[PDB]
Design a protein around this ligand. Structure first.
Ligand SMILES: Nc1ncnc2c1ncn2[C@@H]1O[C@H](COP(=O)(O)OP(=O)(O)NP(=O)(O)O)[C@@H](O)[C@H]1O
Lengths: 418, 181, 5
C-alpha cells in the first residue's frame, strides 16, 4: 500500500493533540530507558560491594533484599497521586498577595509540614543546607500551586521585632551573624536572593535563624517611580510606631513588597550583583538597633526617594544605644554598591569587621540563642499573627495530579527525611 | 484494515524490550506490574483522547465483537465505558494501594488480567476501526513501538491468553522482529 | 541578659 497523506479537517483539538503525543512518547521511552538503566546500575553497584567484603550468604541476600526493598517503594511512589483531603489544615500562618501559608498535618500519616499556597496565571514569569527552609515536594491542581516545607515554629523576624520592639547590640550581633552565614551560603551556590527582609526570616525550635527561600518566585518588581507633585500632631518616634503599625495591620496580607531593604541599584536598570543582599542586611541591622528601617516613610514612593538620595537621608536618632562599631558597620553596608562592604571578594570581608570578634563562626550554630521559642506542642502557632484578613481577589468560584515521576536519587534524600 | 504495508519499519525500537520489560532483579512483581498497568492505561488513554472527537455509533472488529451489551454498545460508548472502568480500578487504593506497606490483594492478579484485557479491547478497537488516519501526522513509529510494548509486557508475565489475540494474531507475528519470543 | 561576644 505505497500511499501518502495530508492535513485539512482535523479540527485543531485533534491536530495539536498529536504534537502533544509525539512529545509524550519520546520523553517517555527516553526515560523508561534511563530508569531501567540506573535500576540496573545501582543493583550491580551493591553486588560489587557485597562480594568485596567476604560476607555470609545470609548477609548478602538481606542486603540484596534491602536494595530491592527500596527499589519497589520507588515505583510505588510514582504511582502515588495526592491532593488536599490528603492534608488536613491546622491553622493559617501568613498571607502574601499571591496566597497564604499553612501549618498542615498529612491525614495519610500526620506530620508537621508547611503549606505554601500560590496562584498560577498570576505569577507570570512567562541543596540541603542548614540555613534555608527545606522544600520536599510540590503538587499542582486546576488553579493554585502547592509546596511542602518544614514548619518553623519560631515565627518570623518581623514578628519578633514587634514583640521586643528593640534588640540589643548582642541579640542583634547574633541574628546578624546568622544572616551572614545564610546569605554567604546562598551566594556560594551562585544565586542572589534579592529579597532579604524581616518577615522573610525564620526561627527554628532552638531559637536559631534560617532563610526561607532564594528569590526565585516570591513576588513582583517596583514601578521604577511615579509622580504626585496645617497643625502638626506628632511626637516623631511615635510617628513611625504609628505608620509602621499601618504597614502590617493593612499591609502584611495583600502586601506590596515594601522597598525598605531594597538596595538602590535595583530601581535603576538591571545592573546588580551578589553585593545586592548585604545592603538589606545593613538595612535590617539598622532596623533592630534603632526601631525602624533606615528609610521608613509615610508611603513607599517617599521611601524610594530616600534610598535614591541615601547619602543625605541616612540619619541615626538621638536614642544612643549604638557603639562606634555598630554605627560604622551599618554605614559601610548602606553605601554605594561597588564600594559596599562585602562587595570585594567579600561575604566574609564582613566577618572581619570589629563589630564581631564573633564566635569561631563554627560554634555559632551550637549556641544558646537570645530567645528559644517556648513551645507547647508540635502545632503551636503561638508565634504567628494568627489573626485573619483573607482578601485575595482571585475567587474563581465553584488524588488528581500524580505528584511525581521523579528520579531515584531524590527518592532516597526525601525518604531519608520525609 | 490492511495494516501490513511497507511501513513495518517501526522507529524508536532501537533495542529489544528485554531491557525495560523484564522484571528487574529483586522487585515486587506487584509494583513492577501495577506501575506498568498505570503506565499503559495512562498512555493508551491519550490515544483514544486524540480520537474521541470522531467516535460515533458505527462497536468492534470483524468475526468477533466486544459487546458491552452482555449483562445488566456502539464504538464511542463502550470505550468511554471500559476506559473509565480502568481509571477507577487503577486509582483504587485497594487493588493499587499507593500507601507504603500495603500488600497486594488476592484479587490483585485477577483484576490485572481484567484491566489488561479491556485495554486490549480498546487497543484493538483502535487497530481495526480507527487505525486508518494514523499515518496522517507521522505517528506510526510511535504506535508501532507502543503496541510492540503492550504485548511484550503482557506476554512476559502472561496476563492475557493466546486465544484472545485472534483479532490481531496476524499482526503480532508481523512485529515479531522486536517481539521478545 | 543574653551576651554574644
Ligand atoms: N516555612 C515556614 N514556616 C512557618 N511560617 C512560614 C514559613 N514560610 C512562611 N511563613 C509565614 O509566612 C511569612 C512569609 O510569607 P511569604 O511566603 O514570604 O509571603 P510572600 O508575599 O510570598 N513573600 P513576602 O510576603 O514578601 O514575605 C512569614 O513571615 C511567616 O509568618
Amino acid at each position: 500500500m505505497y500511499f501518502e497523506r495530508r492535513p485539512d479537517l482535523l479540527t485543531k483539538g485533534t491536530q495539536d493533540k498529536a504534537a502533544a503525543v509525539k512529545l509524550k512518547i519520546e520523553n517517555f521511552y527516553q526515560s523508561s530507558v534511563k530508569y531501567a538503566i540506573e535500576r540496573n546500575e545501582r543493583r550491580v553497584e551493591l553486588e560489587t560491594e557485597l562480594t568485596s567484603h567476604n560476607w555470609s550468604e545470609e548477609r548478602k541476600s538481606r542486603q540484596l533484599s534491602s536494595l530491592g526493598k527500596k527499589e519497589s517503594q520507588f515505583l510505588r511512589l510514582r504511582r502515588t497521586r495526592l491532593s488536599l483531603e490528603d492534608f488536613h489544615t491546622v491553622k493559617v500562618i501568613g498571607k502574601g498577595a499571591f496566597g497564604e501559608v499553612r501549618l498542615v498535618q498529612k491525614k495519610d500519616t500526620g506530620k508537621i509540614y508547611a503549606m505554601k499556597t500560590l496562584l498560577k496565571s498570576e505569577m507570570y514569569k512567562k541543596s540541603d543546607s542548614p540555613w534555608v527552609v527545606s522544600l520536599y515536594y510540590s503538587f499542582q491542581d486546576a488553579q493554585y500551586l502547592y509546596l511542602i516545607m518544614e514548619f518553623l515554629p519560631g515565627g518570623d523576624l518581623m514578628t519578633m521585632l514587634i514583640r521586643w520592639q528593640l534588640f540589643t547590640e548582642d541579640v542583634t550581633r547574633f541574628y546578624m551573624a546568622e544572616c551572614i552565614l545564610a546569605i554567604e551560603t546562598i551566594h556560594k551556590l551562585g544565586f542572589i536572593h534579592r529579597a532579604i527582609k524581616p518577615d522573610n526570616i525564620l526561627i527554628d525550635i532552638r531559637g536559631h535563624i534560617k532563610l526561607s527561600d532564594f528569590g526565585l518566585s516570591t513576588g513582583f518588581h517596583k514601578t521604577h517611580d511615579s509622580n504626585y507633585y496645617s497643625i502638626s500632631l506628632t511626637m516623631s518616634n511615635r510617628q513611625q510606631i504609628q505608620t509602621w503599625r499601618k504597614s502590617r495591620r493593612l499591609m502584611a496580607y495583600s502586601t506590596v513588597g515594601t522597598p525598605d531593604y531594597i538596595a538602590p541599584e535595583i530601581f535603576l536598570y538591571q545592573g546588580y550583583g551578589q553585593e545586592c543582599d548585604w545592603w538589606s542586611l545593613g538595612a535590617i541591622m539598622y532596623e533592630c538597633l534603632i526601631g525602624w528601617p533606615p528609610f521608613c516613610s509615610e508611603t513607599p514612593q517617599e521611601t524610594y526617594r530616600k534610598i535614591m538620595n541615601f547619602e543625605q537621608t541616612l540619619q541615626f536618632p538621638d536614642d544612643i544605644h549604638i557603639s562606634y562599631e555598630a554605627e560604622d558597620l551599618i554605614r559601610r553596608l548602606l553605601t554605594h554598591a561597588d564600594q559596599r562592604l562585602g562587595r570585594h571578594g567579600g561575604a566574609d570581608e564582613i566577618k572581619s569587621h570589629p563589630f564581631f570578634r564573633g564566635v569561631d563562626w563554627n560554634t555559632i550554630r551550637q549556641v544558646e540563642a537570645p530567645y528559644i521559642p517556648k513551645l507547647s506542642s508540635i502545632t503551636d502557632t503561638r508565634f504567628f499573627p494568627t489573626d485573619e484578613l483573607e482578601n485575595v481577589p482571585d475567587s474563581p468560584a465553584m488524588l488528581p495530579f500524580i505528584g511525581y515521576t521523579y528520579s531515584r536519587f531524590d527518592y532516597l534524600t526525601r525518604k531519608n527525611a520525609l | 484494515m490492511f495494516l501490513s504495508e511497507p511501513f513495518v519499519r517501526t522507529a524508536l525500537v532501537k533495542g529489544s524490550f528485554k531491557t525495560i520489560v523484564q522484571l528487574p532483579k529483586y522487585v515486587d512483581l506487584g509494583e513492577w506490574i501495577a506501575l506498568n498497568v498505570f503506565e499503559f492505561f495512562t498512555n493508551l488513554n491519550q490515544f483514544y483522547g486524540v480520537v474521541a472527537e470522531y467516535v460515533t455509533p458505527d462497536n468492534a472488529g470483524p468475526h468477533t465483537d466486544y459487546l458491552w451489551l452482555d449483562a445488566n454498545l456502539p464504538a464511542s460508548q463502550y470505550i468511554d465505558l471500559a476506559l473509565t472502568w480502568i481509571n477507577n480500578k487503577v486509582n483504587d487504593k485497594n487493588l493499587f494501594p499507593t500507601k507504603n506497606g500495603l500488600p497486594f490483594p488476592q484479587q490483585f492478579s485477577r483484576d490485572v488480567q481484567r484491566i489488561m484485557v479491556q485495554m486490549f479491547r480498546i487497543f484493538a478497537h483502535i487497530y481495526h476501526h480507527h487505525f486508518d488516519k494514523i499515518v496522517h501526522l507521522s505517528l506510526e513509529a510511535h504506535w508501532n513501538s507502543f503496541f510492540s510494548h503492550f504485548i511484550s509486557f503482557a506476554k512476559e508475565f502472561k496476563i492475557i491468553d493466546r486465544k484472545e489475540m485472534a483479532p490481531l494474531l496476524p499482526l503480532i507475528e508481523s512485529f515479531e522482529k522486536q517481539g521478545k519470543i | 541578659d543574653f551576651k554574644f561576644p
